[PDB]
Each structure stands twice: as structure tokens, then as C-alpha cells.
Design a protein around this ligand. Sequence first.
Ligand SMILES: CCOc1ccc(CN2CCN(C/C=C/c3ccc(OC)cc3)C[C@@H]2CCO)cc1
Ligand SMILES: [Mg+2]
Length: 270
Amino acid sequence: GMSSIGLAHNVTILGSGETTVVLGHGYGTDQSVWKLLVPYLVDDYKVLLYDHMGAGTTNPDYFDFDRYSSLEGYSYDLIAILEEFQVSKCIYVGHSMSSMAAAVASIFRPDLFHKLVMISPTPRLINTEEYYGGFEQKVMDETLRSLDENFKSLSLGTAPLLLACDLESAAMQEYCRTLFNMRPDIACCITRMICGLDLRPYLGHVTVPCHIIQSSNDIMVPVAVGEYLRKNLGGPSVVEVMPTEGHLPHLSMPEVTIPVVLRHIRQDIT
Ligand SMILES: CCOc1ccc(CN2CCN(C/C=C/c3ccc(OC)cc3)C[C@@H]2CCO)cc1
Ligand SMILES: [Mg+2]
């Protein structure tokens, strides 16, 4: 039985200030992915980092396969973490999956979020006749069907294009280190859940300001998805398309991405 929210999510606190920046790591990583951003924040902000349940650094006995088969399970966990640490009006910075979990959380508890800074978000991968997310339903169905027996070979096969980095690069090695740190059944559950998401009906209920940061070339996120988010979110928004490639530009191209993230943390939409 989980006795401590803070220990179960490996919560880390640094820095000081009137406002707290909360960092969410996204699929396949853990809070270590933020290591180069944090030093630029601590003089001005309190910083809270956490690992989402099912990351390889978390206890698999706490992974509830029912709750984490939908994104809102993560949203409700995030609310509990913020409440446990008495955080409100935070600046939430998240990579893709985490940023969308925070967007959903912000509908239920808008008081906990001053703004969202979202790296590579998408509300839905699967195409419809009117919405282009980049992925055909039937190809997704068959790829997920054999995911269990192919998890490593598929993940290794796509990761260089996903990250826009060479197989032997430091970014590839680091991403694979944390990705394969998940227990395989947990990894497959999270993968199936995020591939199946449709958050389009939630967007109009999101009212907190959203800063959307995108790579110019991201195989998971067409540039049109950033514009879709801008038009369909219920509050203020801004979209920045960076001269980067890859779905995790904060990991693979920090020299461009870190200054961009810092600007959106520091500057509110006017
Ligand atoms: C035409 C190509 O079809 C494909 C269909 C399937 C895959 C399998 N990939 C899909 C992506 N998986 C990570 C999910 C990221 C993500 C991020 C935000 C989000 O927000 C809704 C949803 C998902 C890894 C998984 C195995 C390694 O490749 C690849 C290609
Ligand atoms: Mg809409």
C-alpha cells in the first residue's frame, strides 16, 4: 500500500520563489530528462519534479492497470501531487503526454495552474475524415496487436526517427535507457493508452493559458496539430515552431529548446 505520494512519485523540490514551476517528463523518460533546464529556474522559482506512475523509477506494485489505461488517471494523480505539496497557480511544463495530462487536470482544478507550457503536444494521433493526427486507425490497430512480442524491436527501430538522432547518439542511448527501464507489461499498457487518446472534446474546457512549443519536424505531431490546438483551446494560447527536429527537442537539441522553454515560462501571454 502506498504510504507517501511524494516518495511514490520520486518528488524533488529545488529553488525558491513566489511561483512554482512543475516539470512533467512525458512517455518513456523520467524527471532526469529536465536536468539541463533546472539550473536556469532555481534562482527565480521553486521547482517541483515528479515521475508519473509506471516510469521505471517507480514501484510497479503501485501501477493500477485500470486507472492508467486512460489519461485522466494521470491527471488525477497530478492533482494529488500538487495538493500534497501545497502547490497552486503553478507554471506546468510538460513533454507531450504529460502536458496533455496537465491540460485535463486543469479543467478539474484550474486554480492549481497559472499556465501550461507544452512541448510537442497532440490531442489525438488517429486520423478521421476531418482531423489529421498523422496515423491511420487500422495500421495502429495491427501495430499495437503485436506490441508485446515486438516492444523492443519496434521501439529501437523507430526511436532514431522519433528523436531525429542517430542510433549511436547520446540522446538515443539516454532515451532507450529510461524507456526499457519500464516493466514490459507496464510499458505496453501506457503505450496502448496514449496511442488511443482523443482529447479533442476536452480542449474547449481548458481555460488556463497554453504555450505550445513544437519541432518543425516531428513524426508524432504534424505542424497542423499546433494550429488545431490554438483554435480549439478555450483560453489564451501561443504556438512556437522551433528550428528543431524530433519529438523530444529538449533532449536532442537543448541549445535551441532550453532558451525557448525559458521564454515561455518567464513571459505570460499578453
Ligand atoms: C504511420 C506509423 O504508424 C505507427 C503506429 C504505431 C507506432 C508505435 N509507436 C507509436 C508511438 N508510441 C509512442 C506514443 C507517443 C505519443 C505521444 C503523445 C500522444 O498524445 C495523444 C500519443 C502518443 C510508441 C509506439 C512504439 C514505438 O514506435 C509507430 C508508428
Ligand atoms: Mg473544438
